[PDB]
Amino acid sequence: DLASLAIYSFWIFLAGLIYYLQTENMREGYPLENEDGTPAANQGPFPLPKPKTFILPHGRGTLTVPGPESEDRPIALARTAVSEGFPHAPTGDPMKDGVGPASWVARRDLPELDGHGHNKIKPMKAAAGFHVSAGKNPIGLPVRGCDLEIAGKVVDIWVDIPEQMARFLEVELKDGSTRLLPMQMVKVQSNRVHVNALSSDLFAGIPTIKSPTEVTLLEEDKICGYVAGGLMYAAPKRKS
Amino acid sequence: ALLSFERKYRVPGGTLVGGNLFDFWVGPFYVGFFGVATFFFAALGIILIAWSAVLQGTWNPQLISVYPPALEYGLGGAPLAKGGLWQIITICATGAFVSWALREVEICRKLGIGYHIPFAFAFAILAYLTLVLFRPVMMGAWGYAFPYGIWTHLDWVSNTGYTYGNFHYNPAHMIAISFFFTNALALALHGALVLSAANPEKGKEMRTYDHEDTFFRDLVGYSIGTLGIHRLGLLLSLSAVFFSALCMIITGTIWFDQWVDWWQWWVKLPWWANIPGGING
Amino acid sequence: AEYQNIFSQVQVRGPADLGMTEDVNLANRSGVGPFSTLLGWFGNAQLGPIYLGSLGVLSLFSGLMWFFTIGIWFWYQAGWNPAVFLRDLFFFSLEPPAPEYGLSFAAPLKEGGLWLIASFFMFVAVWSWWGRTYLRAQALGMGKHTAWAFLSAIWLWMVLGFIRPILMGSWSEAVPYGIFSHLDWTNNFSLVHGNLFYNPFHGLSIAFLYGSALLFAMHGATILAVSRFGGERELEQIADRGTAAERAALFWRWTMGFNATMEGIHRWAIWMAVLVTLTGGIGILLSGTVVDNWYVWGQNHG
Numbered sequence: 053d054l055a056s057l058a059i060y061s062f063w064i065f066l067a068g069l070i071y072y073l074q075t076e077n078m079r080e081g082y083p084l085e086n087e088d089g090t091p092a093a094n095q096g097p098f099p100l101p102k103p104k105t106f107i108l109p110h111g112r113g114t115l116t117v118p119g120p121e122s123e124d125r126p127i128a129l130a131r132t133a134v135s136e137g138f139p140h141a142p143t144g145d146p147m148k149d150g151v152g153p154a155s156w157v158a159r160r161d162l163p164e165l166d167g168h169g170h171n172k173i174k175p176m177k178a179a180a181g182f183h184v185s186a187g188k189n190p191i192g193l194p195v196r197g198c199d200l201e202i203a204g205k206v207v208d209i210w211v212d213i214p215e216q217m218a219r220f221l222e223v224e225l226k227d228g229s230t231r232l233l234p235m236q237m238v239k240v241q242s243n244r245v246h247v248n249a250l251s252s253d254l255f256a257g258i259p260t261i262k263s264p265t266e267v268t269l270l271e272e273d274k275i276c277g278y279v280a281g282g283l284m285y286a287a288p289k290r291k292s
Numbered sequence: 293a294l295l296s297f298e299r300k301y302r303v304p305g306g307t308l309v310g311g312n313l314f315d316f317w318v319g320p321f322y323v324g325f326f327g328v329a330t331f332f333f334a335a336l337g338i339i340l341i342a343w344s345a346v347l348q349g350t351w352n353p354q355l356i357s358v359y360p361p362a363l364e365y366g367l368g369g370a371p372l373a374k375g376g377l378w379q380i381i382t383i384c385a386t387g388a389f390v391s392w393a394l395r396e397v398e399i400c401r402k403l404g405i406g407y408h409i410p411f412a413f414a415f416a417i418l419a420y421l422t423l424v425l426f427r428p429v430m431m432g433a434w435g436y437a438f439p440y441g442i443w444t445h446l447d448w449v450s451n452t453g454y455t456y457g458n459f460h461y462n463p464a465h466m467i468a469i470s471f472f473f474t475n476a477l478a479l480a481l482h483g484a485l486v487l488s489a490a491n492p493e494k495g496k497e498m499r500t501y502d503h504e505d506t507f508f509r510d511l512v513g514y515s516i517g518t519l520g521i522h523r524l525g526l527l528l529s530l531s532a533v534f535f536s537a538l539c540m541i542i543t544g545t546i547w548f549d550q551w552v553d554w555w556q557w558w559v560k561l562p563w564w565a566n567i568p569g570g571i572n573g
Numbered sequence: 574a575e576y577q578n579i580f581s582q583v584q585v586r587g588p589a590d591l592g593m594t595e596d597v598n599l600a601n602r603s604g605v606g607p608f609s610t611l612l613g614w615f616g617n618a619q620l621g622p623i624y625l626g627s628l629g630v631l632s633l634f635s636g637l638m639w640f641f642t643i644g645i646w647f648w649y650q651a652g653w654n655p656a657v658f659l660r661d662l663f664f665f666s667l668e669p670p671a672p673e674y675g676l677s678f679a680a681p682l683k684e685g686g687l688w689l690i691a692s693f694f695m696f697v698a699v700w701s702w703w704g705r706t707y708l709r710a711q712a713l714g715m716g717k718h719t720a721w722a723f724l725s726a727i728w729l730w731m732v733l734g735f736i737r738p739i740l741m742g743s744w745s746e747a748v749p750y751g752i753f754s755h756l757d758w759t760n761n762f763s764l765v766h767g768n769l770f771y772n773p774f775h776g777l778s779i780a781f782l783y784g785s786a787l788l789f790a791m792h793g794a795t796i797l798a799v800s801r802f803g804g805e806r807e808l809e810q811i812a813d814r815g816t817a818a819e820r821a822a823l824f825w826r827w828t829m830g831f832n833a834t835m836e837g838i839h840r841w842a843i844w845m846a847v848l849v850t851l852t853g854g855i856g857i858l859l860s861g862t863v864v865d866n867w868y869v870w871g872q873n874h875g
């Protein structure tokens with residue numbers, strides 16, 4: 053009958069949908085590899101999709117996925133076992149090398165631009181109209197590490213203009229040099245800004261930007277990577 | 293066995309229990325101590341559910357059903373074939389769920405991300421535990437819990453519902469439905485937006501976050517933003533299940549009459565309780 | 574101890590954003606409204622500019638007309654007394670025409686009629702708003718995803734009050750306007766079709782609704798967890814995959830054995846949800862037109 057045909061037709065539709073959906077979610081990361089980077093034997097039941105091309109918005113070109121997969125950087129790790137499936141230890145300083153929780157990817161070394169072609173993320177000084185609106189204004193507050201030492205002080209807030217949102221705090225060290233800390237990794241207290249992920253002595257090691265007005269996508273990744281990786285690697289210096 | 297970018301993340305560390313002992317993968321799956329815990333509890337419960345199938349004489353999943361003890365045993369134990377197999381599987385299931393949540397935490401730590409996913413899952417674990425554990429112990433018997441079968445658990449819903457009249461009238465239940473209908477509106481929109489931006493017309497360029505931001509202002513006169521919609525979704529969702537557990541914890545315990553009659557507190561308010569006309573006068 | 578990122582610690586305001594121009598007729602967009610500081614702890618603060626062309630105005634007029642048609646009737650029932658009106662608010666109901674009139678517009682106002690009037694006003698309100706959902710997208714040159722997803726919601730609605738009332742030959746099969754009354758209709762419907770828990774579409778609809786809450790719980794929490802690497806910037810993470818996208822995919826591969834991409838997860842999202850009202854609308858459409866009792870049908874599938 054009518055209802056039996058409807059439901060049976062549905063289950064066949066659903067199986068085509070699951071299929072299509074799963075192949076869509078294979079335009080990155082694939083094909084699978086062995087721990088040594090060569091192509092894995094078993095790829096599972098699903099084929100790679102036919103590539104699609106994004107025309108990027110500001111003449112920044114083209115993206116085609118799936119397409120040739122590579123880390124355009126060296127991985128400082130070694131096997132800890134003779135067979136698949138085990139941890140790969142850092143062969144150096146995991147923080148400095150950018151591995152594990154401290155990983156970054158080699159994104160493009162341009163900043164992200166808004167709809168009109170302007171840098172999405174300005175320091176607030178260079179951003180006209182933009183003021184702290186509610187909550188404690190962090191600019192001027194000293195910055196503390198997970199070891200209970202002072203590392204620097206906040207000298208500006210870098211804001212997302214189109215989101216109208218604080219993405220970073222620019223922080224001055226005893227060098228007189230600045231760093232970016234992500235908003236999402238600091239507690240703005242009343243009398244200070246606290247940073248759990250990093251101890252004071254690791255602040256110098258934060259990756260620095262090559263133009264004090266702007267950040268690139270490559271640079272946010274190295275910075276956010278660095279400081280997040282501290283949650284694991286700076287924990288001999290974390291106190292409570 | 294590895295995504296092209298995966299190896300750099302597969303470092304040692306992050307485990308809550310047992311150090312580098314259970315610190316490995318099997319294919320894509322991370323193990324950990326709680327990976328082992330979740331297999332133990334899962335196998336046991338699956339084997340008890342197979343053994344509960346031979347006591348019933350069915351190997352059909354649309355028929356198999358593992359009922360709680362009857363009210364007669366109260367909050368005490370029960371014989372396997374008459375409610376004890378349920379009681380043990382419930383321990384084994386709760387064991388699998390809490391174990392799974394804690395395995396997610398270990399995966400969190402190794403990846404250096406936040407703990408939001410474990411945290412969100414714990415609300416689902418909590419809704420379950422309300423039904424099979426909190427409402428029982430407050431009422432006075434495991435018998436008020438629901439049975440483990442595909443349609444038999446549905447029959448428990450319909451009967452527990454209709455015990456109280458048309459269950460629509462549980463006011464906490466009303467609220468919870470709103471969050472469910474809303475969370476699905478939001479998930480429809482969020483998915484549609486991102487996709488309409490990433491996949492524009494013909495040979496137009498990929499749209500930007502500003503087009504998403506514009507599109508909504510154009511339409512509804514407001515826009516909440518990327519961080520905003522992902523906070524809204526986690527929140528509608530988690531809130532829907534909070535009001536579900538709530539509407540059930542109060543039914544049968546502080547309220548056991550018909551849910552429709554509860555709404556007489558409103559209609560019998562002394563300022564209008566007696567005025568002629570209307571539906572209720 | 575780390576910040577969780579559900580409310581901002583520090584708000585930041587600048588010049589009112591007037592949006593992208595592309596092809597939009599700026600002659601219609603309003604003036605930027607105020608900036609809600611309350612709103613801004615969670616999402617954006619700007620109650621900025623709403624576009625409002627001719628299709629938008631058509632909607633608001635008839636949407637209010639429907640809203641008023643029902644409401645003046647609630648007073649006629651309340652005896653025009655504000656005290657009663659407020660007491661019996663959930664109890665009032667604008668009910669469809671009696672089965673006598675079938676599919677005609679010949680009913681009195683106090684026996685239907687007013688119901689048809691309201692429904693016409695709602696019909697025109699929803700369809701114009703839909704077209705507005707399409708047009709707003711075209712002006713910006715975006716895909717029509719939002720218009721397709723909205724169509725699926727329209728489906729269920731379109732079935733409950735129009736398609737299915739037509740196929741039974743009666744407006745009585747339609748949902749009345751009332752808070753407690755439309756609830757009663759719903760519980761009633763299940764009963765008369767032999768328990769909708771037996772409708773295999775109903776219970777698929779539930780799977781998707783449950784799954785919508787499960788997915789958005791999953792996604793939302795995942796983007797929050799990787800916002801420390803700027804995960805929320807999903808469009809750019811699609812064109813240039815960051816570590817946010819990677820540890821997000823990797824959390825889930827390591828947990829459950831497979832994963833999504835930053836684009837792909839939104840295809841999962843729009844479908845999971847859109848199938849709630851798609852399946853659910855077929856399940857209602859079959860109830861009473863082809864299947865009289867979902868218990869009976871279930872016994873001898875057919």
Ligand code: BCL
Binds near residue numbers: 473474755
């Ligand atoms: C399963 C489908 C059944 C049904 C079963 C149920 C059940 C079961 C419940 C509801 C509930 C609700 N239903 Mg219903 N309902 C159906 C079809 C509808 C339709 C329709 C198709 O046009 C509408 C407009 C409503 C509207 C409503 C709301 C009063 C309420 C919460 C809705 C919501 O969370 O939206 C998502 C959220 C939004 C914010 C969307 C925006 C719309 C908002 C603003 C609500 C508008 C309400 C209305 C137009 C005016 C009310 C005026 C009064 C003075 C309050 N239902 C059909 C008949 N409905 C719940 C309730 O608590 O009712 C008392 C509830 O428990």
Ligand code: BCL
Binds near residue numbers: 438779780783784
């Ligand atoms: C939640 C509130 C009520 C309830 C009310 C309903 C109603 C009403 C309906 C269901 C439906 C379903 N019920 Mg239930 N159900 C309850 C508690 C539970 C629990 C539990 C707490 O452990 C489980 C496992 C399930 C439920 C199941 C699924 C088999 C089914 C669809 C779920 C889904 O698609 O979305 C959730 C999840 C996803 C989309 C992803 C995961 C889905 C997979 C398929 C999980 C199913 C596993 C199942 C077969 C058990 C295997 C056990 C061992 C591994 C062998 N419910 C309580 C009693 N349930 C619908 C149905 O399909 O009828 C039979 C339906 O109409």
Ligand code: BCL
Binds near residue numbers: 453536
């Ligand atoms: C005839 C039936 C009655 C009625 C009686 C009840 C009763 C009684 C109950 C509800 C409950 C619910 N009702 Mg009702 N309800 C009715 C009509 C409705 C209508 C409608 C008319 O449109 C709607 C929309 C709802 C909506 C809802 C929800 C608010 C709620 C279910 C969600 C939930 O709790 O998730 C919670 C989710 C879970 C518990 C799942 C947790 C999953 C666990 C942690 C893990 C599972 C792992 C799995 C086994 C592994 C799979 C193996 C493989 C790996 C896949 N009801 C009518 C009036 N309603 C239920 C509720 O509120 O629950 C507290 C409930 O018990």
Ligand code: BCL
Binds near residue numbers: 476769778
């Ligand atoms: C006693 C009640 C019966 C029963 C009878 C029904 C009936 C009757 C129906 C459902 C339907 C549904 N039921 Mg049931 N259901 C029961 C028990 C349950 C239980 C449970 C016990 O746990 C659950 C989980 C559900 C769950 C569900 C949903 C999956 C489904 C509705 C999807 C939806 O989102 O509609 C919400 C969305 C809409 C109605 C569409 C809205 C779109 C329109 C266009 C919006 C208009 C807005 C307006 C113009 C303006 C608003 C004002 C604003 C301010 C602007 N039912 C029992 C068995 N159920 C529906 C279905 O899908 O059947 C298969 C249905 O019709």
Ligand SMILES: CC[C@H]1c2cc3[nH]c4c(c3C)C(=O)[C@H](C(=O)OC)c4c3nc(cc4[nH]c(cc(n2)[C@@H]1C)c(C(C)=O)c4C)[C@@H](C)[C@@H]3CCC(=O)OC/C=C(\C)CCC[C@H](C)CCC[C@H](C)CCCC(C)C
Binds near residue numbers: 636702725
């Ligand atoms: C797949 C289905 C799911 C879903 C999806 C969905 N809904 C959608 C969309 C999508 C993808 C849209 O794009 C569209 C939308 O507009 O998004 C915001 C919409 C929409 N879903 C809506 C509601 C809605 N969706 C529902 C359900 C669902 N929608 C499911 C969860 C429900 C349920 C649960 O029953 C409701 C209540 C609307 C918000 C919107 C379509 C609005 C519409 O078409 O009506 C036109 C306008 C009016 C009737 C307004 C007048 C009535 C008001 C009560 C008066 C107040 C208005 C105003 C403030 C007055 C101001 C007057 C002057 C002084 C200015």
Ligand SMILES: CC[C@H]1c2cc3[nH]c4c(c3C)C(=O)[C@H](C(=O)OC)c4c3nc(cc4[nH]c(cc(n2)[C@@H]1C)c(C(C)=O)c4C)[C@@H](C)[C@@H]3CCC(=O)OC/C=C(\C)CCC[C@H](C)CCC[C@H](C)CCCC(C)C
Binds near residue numbers: 388414533
């Ligand atoms: C806030 C609650 C919302 C939500 C969120 C949510 N669920 C989650 C998560 C989150 C954030 C995860 O991280 C986790 C996940 O890994 O997703 C893929 C998960 C998860 N939610 C799941 C299911 C699920 N969630 C549900 C609901 C919800 N989850 C809400 C919508 C439902 C509903 C609606 O019914 C179901 C069925 C799983 C896919 C997964 C957890 C998997 C897991 O716990 O693995 C360990 C356990 C086993 C492998 C099973 C072992 C077998 C048992 C020991 C015995 C079986 C007993 C059982 C009672 C049988 C009952 C059957 C009958 C009732 C039919």
Ligand SMILES: COC(C)(C)C/C=C/C(C)=C/C=C/C(C)=C/C=C/C(C)=C\C=C\C=C(C)\C=C\C=C(/C)CC/C=C(\C)CCC=C(C)C
Binds near residue numbers: 730731734735748752
């Ligand atoms: C404060 O006092 C004032 C004056 C402001 C008024 C107050 C307003 C009030 C109290 C409003 C209350 C309204 C309510 C509560 C409405 C509730 C609706 C509910 C709860 C559910 C709605 C479901 C209705 C649906 C599914 C209707 C579907 C209708 C359609 C599919 C279209 C049907 C169209 C028809 C019959 C006409 C066909 C005509 C043509 C030519 C196309």
Ligand SMILES: CCCCCCCCCCCC[N+](C)(C)[O-]
Binds near residue numbers: 066068069
């Ligand atoms: C193998 C039988 C196929 C039956 C039909 C399956 C439908 C596939 C659903 C995905 C369609 C996707 N779309 C619209 C983007 O092309």
Ligand SMILES: CCCCCCCCCCCC[N+](C)(C)[O-]
Binds near residue numbers: 070095
């Ligand atoms: C609702 C659940 C849908 C599950 C769909 C199938 C998921 C498993 C397929 C993923 C295959 C992946 N892998 C590891 C080969 O890359």
Ligand SMILES: CCCCCCCCCCCC[N+](C)(C)[O-]
Binds near residue numbers: 095293320
């Ligand atoms: C209920 C659906 C469960 C889906 C489970 C999907 C697990 C896929 C496992 C693929 C194993 C792949 N490998 C070795 C290539 O990584």
Ligand SMILES: CCCCCCCCCCCC[N+](C)(C)[O-]
Binds near residue numbers: 774777
């Ligand atoms: C986005 C795809 C998600 C697929 C979810 C699959 C849930 C299957 C639920 C089966 C229960 C159905 N029923 C009642 C019709 O038999």
Ligand SMILES: [Fe+3]
Binds near residue numbers: 482486792796807839
């Ligand atoms: Fe998203």
